[PDB]
């Protein structure tokens, strides 16, 4: 059952799949990216101690450690009240291992020694220095006697060394905590190698133990047991006198950047149409958390993927560093805390901006109150904010003046107006889009350039992709995903010199790619993608593509059909060639062929057919696409040519040219690339859903009764839909 | 000496260099021309080193190079710093300009060298750069210590040393990095340029690489065939270049090995230099698989074009390394050729760093081509596999072995300086024990340590528990030795103020800064017993000197030595103690510091301070000013209530509360918690005193010590004992110690405000600025409801004085 997967310190809550999809007011929580290492939970990564070497002093003190571990264990058992018993009786408090160590069962003795040497080997492994303090003190410190109650029934004498004078340092306490974490890790690793798993309830039948969790999640009971056992271990070591020094603490520089590769921050702005070009304006920014957050005024042309203030498009305040951001950063104001209020005001008809923290004016390095004092009006300003990982903000535009908590303190007297001072309806949000989308390559793009080579009597029409910035300053070297603006649609139902009649009849289309010499062919993937492809991953391989297999058929009479569904059908150019290495005298040509009548996808190497093929579902739209990591100024070149007995791509792309064997590259067809520079519009109203727990027996009711519709504009050639 | 040299120098220094000085701001960003501007700087510095130049020409050189370097980006001129680092220390006559340039460069790039993120958008200093800075720093110490006294030379040496010390990040920089890198440099470093290519005679190629050698010989023949058809050469059975026919355009497969060995020779030299430098080649399965996997006349008109292939960054530095070796080999050959001839001087004889990109082009392309052919065949060259162990990771190599702790150890200059005075004071002479070392210390060490500690204010008091600094915090035993620089307190004895002379102010300012730079918590928790003894011994000595000052002010001693003792107190002892006690009170270090015997000495100090405050004698009449700052500092620092004695048992830090077994009576004690302060101050006594103050018609000029000493006592005292738990739960270990602070301090808020109001009401006043500073922490406690109706009379008194001043003048 699904309730058994709950973490012990959490409760089941039927919440929204999305984060902003809640019908609310200006009090809506704007959320930045979230650190994505939440539920990985248990991944056993123990400290490897098999490689290390045991010094002779630790070697001959090892048996002393093992022995004293034996006495401390029997002391704990006898003081809790255990007694010798052939069978394990927890309720009766009987223990079989409570035996003379020599006569003790050999397997339990191997345990008692393996804990000891693994403990000391871990001590060695994580860099603890072992040194001589006083061998005379080691010889002096002896074991005193114990009363008959502390004497175990087995006849042995628990002999406690001088624990009275032993003191513990905080560094030793910290390394002992590390040792407890490592011991829990190795134990649970062994448990899983036996075959156990985690469960909210302990069940031997299903081999589920709620203790297979990270040490931080581990309950204090076993955690305190490890604490105390390791107290006796470390105090045994200190009584033996070989002093230990743990390595000094290391600062944390990971910066907790665990968001997805698409986003490191999220930008929320007002709509462009709400741009103000003259007057006094004020708005409020509440900071539910304190961290990497910026707030200010942005030009309509501000980019979602760029940090606020890193360019001329935005004037921002960053309280995390107590800085102001516009074409760089300068120290400005103080740093906020949790639950603070930043009032941003712009007085545009004499071109000034000021920021207030909790109603207090913020100053420059000098005594000047003006954050930015000379900016051309241009096309106006709109409220904007940027939030980093695990950051929660709120923007109040002053639609209800009473909601502003510091407008009266600063701004009402100065004559500044709330941004939504007189608006009959709520202002519209726009967010940095999370899913990348294909869009035409800009003519002013920094890195890539697309040139259209007109076809001739000898050369077919082509579209060459080149890197403007290759070999130049700080050029981006990442896998970029290009596609063609127009798809090939497979047949709605599947049937179950080249010949001119065959050309006329056939529904087979061809295109090719030329990977230029000097460009790594192993970094180029060629094939087809659907409109559902949005995976912008720095490391792309043909094994991480999304794929499903839907099997239809009675299980009694076996599966009668299986269909493989995917959004990417490509082959690597280097694997396609594999003629060894080399042979890069001329650009490598890979030809993609699609038979739309049968939905068959085939690929051809430099004159030879490849072994990789695909079969797509009927009515599938396939976009020609190339994924390339640039290792050359000239990377690759789409070629809209044709081969024997195969129609050109333009025939399937355009209905007018359906029966035109002459290859063509009409102006509508162009090269688009996957990008993050797009905006998403928050709906002004969400579905009102009610979620509750009726009872233990009934379950979790969710209810949605009020209808809510939106009008969808469909772009047909891109197979896309927008509001 | 030739007329051409003079005329050329005149032309340069009158037309070229001033123009570059005028257009220096244009050198902001030169990412393209790193080599070009490095060549410019190297040539300019070579002209500076050159002799037979006039003073005006030298000044023009200096100003031009200073402007260019100042406008230049920190990343480049690394080679210029290399040459300066080698040349400045032994130089003491032409080092004026290089020293000033280093000072300006380090002052500009202060953040770049120290801050781990660097300047900002420029990265941080490389390990080689910071090691070079280390070498410069220590070489300048050695040269400055050994050299004789020159006033202007030292006046430049001190700022450069301070700038380099501030720039080098004291926490880690490299911890001397064990410094296993020993990259040989041409003795252009050691004078003029002669190249010394690394010998590869003992190096022999393995019998494994010969497939690669043969294949690159094939590629070399391909390139020479490209020469063939570019020049238009044609196949010929005989050698005749005059008839424009190429000898034997015919494949290496069947060519003789003689000229094939000629092609092989550069390959062998390259690989022998490879192995002599000690990098070795690893072979992948891609390359090895290819090795195992692989018409008439018509030699291949196609060759693999390699300019398209890219190279990794480390391999690029490698290619630059081979390029500089190749240029060294060529320069050496040309040098023997010119030596065999008569005095030849080829323009390209300058070192690789002084070369320009156009001249570096052939060496760079050859090195990149050989590396790219390696990469294509699948052979990867390996750099730090030799001596791959370095053992630092900042874990085994604590602190800074050769900069920070070596600097603080070389502060033993102060200990030997004390020893020198101990030897010399017994009949101080004109020649001194060692006047050179005396002057060196006096004019170098004190300002150096002062500015260094001011710059690294934040680092030393940064701690793991309290993150003062975003970077690494100060280290164990290095905080202890920083405290152990209290040898500067072991010196400056009562009689040594005149012996220092004008340096008394310098040393007391240095001591101010060093005392502000202290970590008492770490010193007591993890410190050496001798250092603890030195600290407690100095504070005991300060208490003893204050008691001696009381014997002086008794008038039984003043009725020479007494006057100089009093002057020592006033000029050093009182301000330095005031600063140290302000620091410990600000950082709450007084609780850890003042425990038992320091507590005894602090009660002695207190009796002294209150005694001089109440001393109406005119001798301390001038001194009453800073006496006020001192007793306020001690009141805000000392951790046991002074004027509340009935709560000594409640207080946990009391001397009796800590050592009531035997030690309190073992030591010299007043035997009673009320007797610990034989002076008058008691609670309601001083309430009533400050109430009647300025209400009984008293005048500052009549008797000013009351409002000059007692209010600052009250100010700092209530400041920190309201730092002691404000409005917590009483009797629960939060106000056992104080309890009574809940309301009387709140009422004497208004008491002191009204006293100030009466002090303004009386006609004349300027001392309240000190009183205003002392009252600053108090008005922080003042809430708005009692700033209303309480600071309005402050405005009334302000306008009253304004009107009176306007009417009078
Ligand atoms: N010689 C021994 N005598 C008693 N207990 C031992 C001995 N050696 C190991 N153990 C501990 O007893 C456990 C046996 O019980 P089991 O395998 O069911 O797990 P567990 O009691 O949940 O373990 P743990 O206390 O480590 O979480 C071992 O996992 C181990 O932790």
């Amino acid at each position: 059952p699904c309730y058994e997967a709950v973490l012990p310190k959490e409760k089941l809550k039927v919440e929204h799949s999305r984060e902003y999809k809640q019908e609310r007011t200006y009090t809506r929580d704007l959320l930045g990216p979230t650190v994505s290492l939440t539920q990985a939970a248990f991944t056993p990564i123990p400290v490897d101690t098999s490689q290390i070497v045991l010094p002779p002093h630790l070697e001959r003190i090892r048996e002393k450690l093992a022995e004293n571990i034996h006495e401390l264990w029997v002391m704990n058992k006898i003081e809790l009240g255990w007694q010798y018993g052939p069978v394990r009786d927890d309720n009766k408090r009987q223990h079989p291992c409570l035996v003379e160590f020599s006569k003790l069962p050999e397997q339990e003795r191997n345990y008692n020694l393996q804990m000891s040497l693994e403990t000391l080997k871990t001590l060695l492994a994580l860099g603890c220095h072992v040194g001589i303090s006083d061998e005379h003190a080691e010889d002096k410190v002896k074991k005193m006697k114990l009363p008959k109650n502390y004497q175990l029934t087995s006849g042995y004498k628990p002999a406690p060394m001088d624990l009275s004078f032993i003191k513990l340092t905080p560094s030793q306490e910290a390394m002992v905590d590390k040792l407890a974490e490592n011991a829990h890790n190795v134990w649970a690793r062994d448990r899983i190698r036996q075959g156990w798993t985690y469960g909210i309830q302990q069940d031997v039948k299903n081999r589920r133990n709620p203790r297979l969790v990270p040490y931080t999640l581990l309950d204090d009971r076993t955690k305190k047991s490890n604490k105390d056992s390791l107290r006796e271990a470390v105090r045994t070591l200190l009584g033996y006198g070989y002093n230990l020094e743990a390595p000094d603490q290391d600062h944390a520089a990971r910066a907790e950047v665990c968001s997805g590769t698409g986003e490191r921050f999220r930008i929320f702005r007002a709509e462009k149409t709400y741009a103000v070009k003259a007057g006094r304006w004020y708005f409020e920014f509440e900071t539910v958390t304190a961290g990497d957050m910026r707030v200010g005024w942005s030009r309509p042309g501000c980019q979602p993927d760029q940090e606020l203030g890193s360019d001329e498009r935005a004037f921002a305040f960053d309280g995390f560093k107590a800085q102001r951001w516009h074409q760089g950063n300068e120290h400005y104001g103080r740093s906020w805390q949790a639950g603070d209020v930043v009032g941003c005001m712009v007085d545009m008809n004499e071109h000034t901006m000021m920021f207030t923290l909790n109603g207090e004016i913020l100053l420059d390095d000098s005594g000047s109150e003006l954050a930015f004092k000379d900016f051309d009006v241009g096309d106006g300003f709109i409220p904007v904010c940027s939030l980093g990982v695990a950051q929660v903000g709120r923007m109040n535009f002053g639609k209800d003046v009473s909601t502003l908590k510091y407008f009266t303190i600063c701004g009402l007297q100065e004559g500044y107006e709330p941004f939504a001072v007189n608006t009959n309806r709520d202002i519209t949000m726009w967010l940095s889009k999370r899913l990348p989308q294909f869009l035409q390559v800009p003519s002013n793009h920094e890195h890539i350039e697309v040139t259209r080579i007109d076809g001739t009597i000898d050369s077919s029409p082509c579209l060459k992709v080149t890197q403007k910035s290759f070999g130049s300053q700080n050029s981006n070297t990442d896998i970029m995903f290009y596609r063609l603006s127009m798809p090939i649609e497979c047949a709605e139902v599947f049937s179950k010199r080249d010949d001119y009649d065959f050309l006329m009849q056939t529904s087979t289309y061809y295109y090719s790619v030329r990977i230029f010499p000097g460009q790594e062919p192993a970094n180029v993937w060629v094939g087809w993608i659907t409109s559902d492809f949005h995976q912008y991953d720095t490391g792309f391989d043909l094994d991480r593509v999304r794929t499903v297999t839907v099997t239809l058929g009675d299980e009694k009479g076996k599966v009668h059909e299986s269909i493989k569904r995917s959004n990417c059908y490509m082959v690597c150019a280097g694997e396609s060639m594999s003629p060894g290495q080399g042979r890069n005298n001329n650009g490598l040509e890979i030809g993609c062929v699609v038979d739309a009548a049968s939905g068959l996808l085939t690929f051809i190497a430099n004159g030879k057919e490849l072994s990789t093929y695909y079969q797509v579902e009927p009515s599938t739209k396939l976009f020609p696409a190339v994924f390339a990591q640039a290792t050359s100024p000239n990377v690759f070149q789409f070629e809209l040519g044709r081969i024997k007995n195969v129609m050109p791509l333009s025939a399937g792309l355009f209905k007018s040219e359906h029966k035109n064997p002459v290859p063509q590259c009409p102006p509508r067809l162009h090269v688009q690339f996957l990008s993050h520079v797009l905006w998403s519009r928050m709906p002004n109203q969400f579905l009102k859903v009610d979620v509750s727990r009726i009872s233990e027996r009934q379950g979790w009711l969710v209810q949605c009764l009020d209808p809510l519709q939106f009008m969808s504009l469909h772009i047909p050639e891109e197979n896309r839909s927008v509001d | 000496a030739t007329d051409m040299a003079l005329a050329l120098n005149r032309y340069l220094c009158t037309a070229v260099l001033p123009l570059l000085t005028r257009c220096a701001p244009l050198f902001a960003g030169t990412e393209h021309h790193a080599s070009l501007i490095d060549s410019l700087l190297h040539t300019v510095y070579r002209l500076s080193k050159g002799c037979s130049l006039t003073k005006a020409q030298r000044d023009s050189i200096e100003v031009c190079l200073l402007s260019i370097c100042g406008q230049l980006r920190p990343s480049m001129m690394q080679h210029l710093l290399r040459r300066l680092v080698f040349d400045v220390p032994l130089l003491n006559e032409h080092a004026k300009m290089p020293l000033k340039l280093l000072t300006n460069h380090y002052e500009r790039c202060w953040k770049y060298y120290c801050l781990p993120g660097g300047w900002g958008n420029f990265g941080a200093a490389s390990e080689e750069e910071l090691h070079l800075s280390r070498k410069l720093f220590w070489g300048i110490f050695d040269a400055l210590s050994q050299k004789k006294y020159e006033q202007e030379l030292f006046k430049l040496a001190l700022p450069c040393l301070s700038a380099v010390a501030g720039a080098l990040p004291p926490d880690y920089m490299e911890s001397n990095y064990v410094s296993m890198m020993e990259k040989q440099s041409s003795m252009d470093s050691e004078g003029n340029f002669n190249p010394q290519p690394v010998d590869t005679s003992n190096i022999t190629i393995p019998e494994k690489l010969e497939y690669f050698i043969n294949k690159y010989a094939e590629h070399s023949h391909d390139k020479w065939s490209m020469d063939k058809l570019a020049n238009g050469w044609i196949y010929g059975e005989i050698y005749s270049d005059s008839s424009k026919v190429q000898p034997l355009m015919k494949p290496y497969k069947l060519l003789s090995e003689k000229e094939k060995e000629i092609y092989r020779w550069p390959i062998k030299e390259s690989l022998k230099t490879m192995l002599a430098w000690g990098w070795r080649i690893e072979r992948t399965r891609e390359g090895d698989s290819m090795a195992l996997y692989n018409a008439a006349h018509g030699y291949s008109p196609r060759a693999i074009d390699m300019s398209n292939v890219t190279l990794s960054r480390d391999l690029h530095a490698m290619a630059e390394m081979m390029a500089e070796n190749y240029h060294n080999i060529w320069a050496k050959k040309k040098k023997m050729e010119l030596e065999s001839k008569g005095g030849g001087n080829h323009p390209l004889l300058v070192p690789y760093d002084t070369l320009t990109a156009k001249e570096k082009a052939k060496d760079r392309e050859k090195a990149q081509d050989i590396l790219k052919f390696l990469q294509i065949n699948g052979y990867a060259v390996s750099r730090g596999f030799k001596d791959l162990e370095l053992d630092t990771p900042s874990i085994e190599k604590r602190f800074a072995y050769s900069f920070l702790q070596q600097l603080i150890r070389y502060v033993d200059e102060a200990h030997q300086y004390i020893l020198e005075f101990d030897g010399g004071s017994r009949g101080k002479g004109e020649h001194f024990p060692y006047e050179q070392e005396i002057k060196f210390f006096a004019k170098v060490v004190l300002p150096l340590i002062d500015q260094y500690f001011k710059n690294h204010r934040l680092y030393f008091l940064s701690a793991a528990s309290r993150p003062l600094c975003s970077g690494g915090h100060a280290s164990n035993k290095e905080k202890e030795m920083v405290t152990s620089l209290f040898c500067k307190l072991g010196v400056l004895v009562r009689h040594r103020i005149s012996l220092f002379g004008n340096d008394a102010t310098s040393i007391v300012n240095c001591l101010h800064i060093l005392g502000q730079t202290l970590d008492a918590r770490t010193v007591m928790k993890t410190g050496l017993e001798s250092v603890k003894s030195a600290l407690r011994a100095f504070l005991d000595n300060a208490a003893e000197d204050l008691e001696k000052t009381m014997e002086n002010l008794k008038q039984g001693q003043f009725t020479k030595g007494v006057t100089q003792i009093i002057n020592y107190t006033t000029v050093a002892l009182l301000p330095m103690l005031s600063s140290l006690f302000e620091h410990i009170g600000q950082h709450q270090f007084g609780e850890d510091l003042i425990l038992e015997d320091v507590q005894v000495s602090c009660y002695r100090i207190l009796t002294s301070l209150y005694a001089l405050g109440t001393s109406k004698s005119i001798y301390v009449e001038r001194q009453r000013s800073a006496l006020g700052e001192c007793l306020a500092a001690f009141a805000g620092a000392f951790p046991v209530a002074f004027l509340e004695t009935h709560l000594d048992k409640h207080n946990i830090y009391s001397i009796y509360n800590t050592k009531s077994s035997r030690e309190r009576a073992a030591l010299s004690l007043p035997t009673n918690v009320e007797d610990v302060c034989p002076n008058i101050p008691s609670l309601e006594k001083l309430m009533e005193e400050i109430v009647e103050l300025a209400e009984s018609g008293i005048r500052y000029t009549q008797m000013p010590h009351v409002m000059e000493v007692i209010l600052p006592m009250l100010c700092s005292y209530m400041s920190r004992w309201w730092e002691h738990g404000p409005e917590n739960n009483p009797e629960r270990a939060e106000m056992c110690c104080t309890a009574l602070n809940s309301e009387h301090m709140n009422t004497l808020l208004g008491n002191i405000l009204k006293i100030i109001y009466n002090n303004l009401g009386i006609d004349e006043g300027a001392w309240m600025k000190r009183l205003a500073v002392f009252s600053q922490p108090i008005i922080n406690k003042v809430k708005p409801q009692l700033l209303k109706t309480h600071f309005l009379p402050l405005m009334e008194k302000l306008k009253k004085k304004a009107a009176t001043v306007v009417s009078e003048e």
Side-chain angles (χ1 to χ4, degrees), chain B residues 129-144 146-339:
Chain B
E129 272 206 65
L130 60 93
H131 184 91
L132 185 85
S133 296
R134 266 184 185 264
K135 289 211 172 297
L136 168 72
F137 193 74
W138 285 114
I140 294 283
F141 291 171
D142 188 22
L144 171 66
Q146 303 312 119
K147 211 66 177 184
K148 326 171 274 182
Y149 175 50
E150 177 163 49
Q151 57 201 4
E152 52 92 15
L153 178 60
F154 294 0
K155 186 69 177 294
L156 294 174
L158 190 58
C160 186
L161 271 181
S162 285
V164 174
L168 280 191
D171 176 58
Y172 172 73
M173 73 291 291
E174 70 182 2
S175 293
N176 204 7
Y177 198 69
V178 186
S179 303
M180 73 291 291
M181 73 291 291
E182 194 273 300
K183 187 66 206 208
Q184 291 182 357
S185 84
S186 62
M187 61 79 71
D188 171 70
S189 165
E190 186 68 54
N192 53 3
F193 175 74
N194 81 31
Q196 281 292 348
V198 178
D199 212 327
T200 79
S201 310
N202 67 48
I203 301 299
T204 50
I205 54 171
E207 212 355 358
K208 277 79 70 176
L209 276 298
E210 277 71 355
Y211 177 106
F212 182 80
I213 327 179
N214 300 306
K215 197 169 181 291
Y216 182 76
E218 322 186 320
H219 192 255
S220 314
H221 198 298
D222 291 330
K223 298 195 295 290
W224 182 65
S225 301
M226 295 298 137
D227 245 13
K228 160 259 179 187
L229 73 165
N231 222 32
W233 293 97
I234 310 103
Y235 179 72
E237 60 166 359
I238 206 65
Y239 157 64
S240 143
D241 292 334
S242 54
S243 68
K244 195 68 173 68
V245 68
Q246 185 270 2
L248 72 164
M249 186 66 204
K250 185 260 194 177
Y252 64 89
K253 297 294 289 184
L254 273 298
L255 292 176
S256 54
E257 60 89 20
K258 277 74 69 177
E259 62 273 16
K260 209 266 187 184
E261 179 51 58
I262 301 299
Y263 287 146
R264 185 183 296 113
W265 183 257
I267 304 167
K268 301 163 49 59
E269 300 302 325
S270 179
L271 274 297
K272 291 185 142 202
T273 288
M274 241 3 200
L275 294 182
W277 283 355
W279 316 337
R280 80 289 185 255
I281 286 179
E282 200 277 331
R283 293 203 177 125
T284 187
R285 203 41 57 208
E286 290 185 354
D288 295 330
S289 299
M290 295 299 120
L292 60 88
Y293 182 76
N294 60 7
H297 307 286
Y299 182 76
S300 158
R302 175 257 179 188
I304 54 171
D305 294 329
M306 262 189 234
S307 83
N308 186 345
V309 192
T310 176
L311 194 65
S312 75
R313 299 295 12 178
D314 176 66
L315 296 175
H316 182 260
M318 290 285 228
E320 294 290 327
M321 186 130 357
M322 283 74 74
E324 69 174 70
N325 197 332
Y326 293 141
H327 178 254
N328 288 5
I329 294 156
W330 175 93
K332 183 70 175 177
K333 282 183 168 65
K334 175 60 56 175
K335 186 179 289 293
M336 287 74 71
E337 285 268 279
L338 303 173
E339 288 290 329

Side-chain angles (χ1 to χ4, degrees), chain A residues 68-321:
Chain A
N68 189 179
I69 280 170
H70 173 261
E71 293 83 4
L72 64 88
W73 186 86
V74 303
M75 293 180 183
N76 291 119
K77 300 303 137 177
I78 192 63
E79 70 93 20
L80 200 151
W82 300 79
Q83 67 270 14
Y84 171 74
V87 73
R88 283 181 291 275
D89 288 331
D90 52 354
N91 51 304
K92 290 175 70 176
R93 194 176 63 188
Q94 298 197 346
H95 211 280
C97 193
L98 189 65
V99 180
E100 180 72 29
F101 63 95
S102 55
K103 193 260 182 182
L104 196 145
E106 190 62 28
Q107 61 102 15
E108 291 170 350
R109 182 68 176 171
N110 306 122
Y111 292 165
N112 305 328
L113 63 88
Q114 65 102 21
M115 291 93 89
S116 60
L117 75 163
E118 289 296 328
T119 301
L120 58 88
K121 284 162 76 175
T122 44
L123 301 176
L124 294 174
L126 73 165
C128 295
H129 295 7
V130 54
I132 172 167
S133 178
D134 189 27
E135 201 269 337
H136 298 138
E138 168 158 12
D139 302 332
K140 275 195 276 311
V141 54
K142 299 289 94 175
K143 294 97 178 179
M144 73 291 291
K145 303 287 104 176
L146 279 188
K148 300 288 105 177
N149 58 5
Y150 270 44
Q151 297 282 358
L152 73 165
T153 187
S154 179
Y156 182 69
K157 194 267 175 184
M161 153 254 260
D162 296 332
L163 277 297
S164 64
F165 85 106
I166 295 300
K167 67 179 290 294
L168 190 63
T169 61
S171 64
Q172 290 304 111
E173 171 64 33
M175 62 105 71
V176 170
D177 301 333
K178 314 316 185 304
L179 214 159
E181 188 274 331
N182 168 257
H184 180 74
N185 269 38
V186 299
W187 175 79
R189 166 197 68 176
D190 296 319
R191 296 281 75 77
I192 291 173
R193 297 284 74 78
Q194 271 71 242
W196 278 53
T197 185
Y198 163 73
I200 199 167
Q201 186 266 358
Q202 155 77 56
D203 182 26
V204 179
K205 175 68 176 177
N206 265 285
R207 312 157 61 94
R208 302 178 195 172
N209 188 2
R211 300 193 314 247
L212 275 69
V213 293
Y215 197 64
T216 63
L217 276 328
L218 180 76
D219 69 277
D220 214 329
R221 189 265 299 167
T222 55
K223 189 182 256 155
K224 189 261 290 183
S225 72
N226 290 322
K227 293 181 176 67
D228 63 60
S229 307
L230 254 169
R231 301 278 58 79
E232 289 103 14
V234 73
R235 293 176 71 89
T236 292
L237 186 152
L238 290 198
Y240 285 160
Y242 268 62
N243 64 7
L244 290 205
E245 289 79 44
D248 56 279
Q249 182 253 322
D250 292 330
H251 295 285
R254 276 83 66 191
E256 74 184 40
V257 186
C258 295
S259 164
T261 179
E263 284 186 349
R264 197 177 67 247
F265 55 93
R266 189 72 176 272
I267 293 179
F268 317 78
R269 67 164 171 90
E271 193 160 289
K272 295 182 186 184
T273 67
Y274 287 99
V276 288
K277 271 175 131 164
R280 336 281 290 273
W281 302 113
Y282 159 90
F283 79 92
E284 181 178 1
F285 181 61
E286 186 207 296
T287 69
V288 191
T289 74
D292 199 48
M293 291 182 327
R294 288 178 215 192
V295 60
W297 307 85
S298 87
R299 299 277 175 85
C302 182
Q303 271 153 10
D305 48 332
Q306 279 315 311
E307 284 156 350
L308 282 188
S310 54
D311 202 68
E312 70 264 10
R313 270 78 175 272
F315 307 78
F317 165 57
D318 177 27
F320 188 58
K321 300 295 197 294

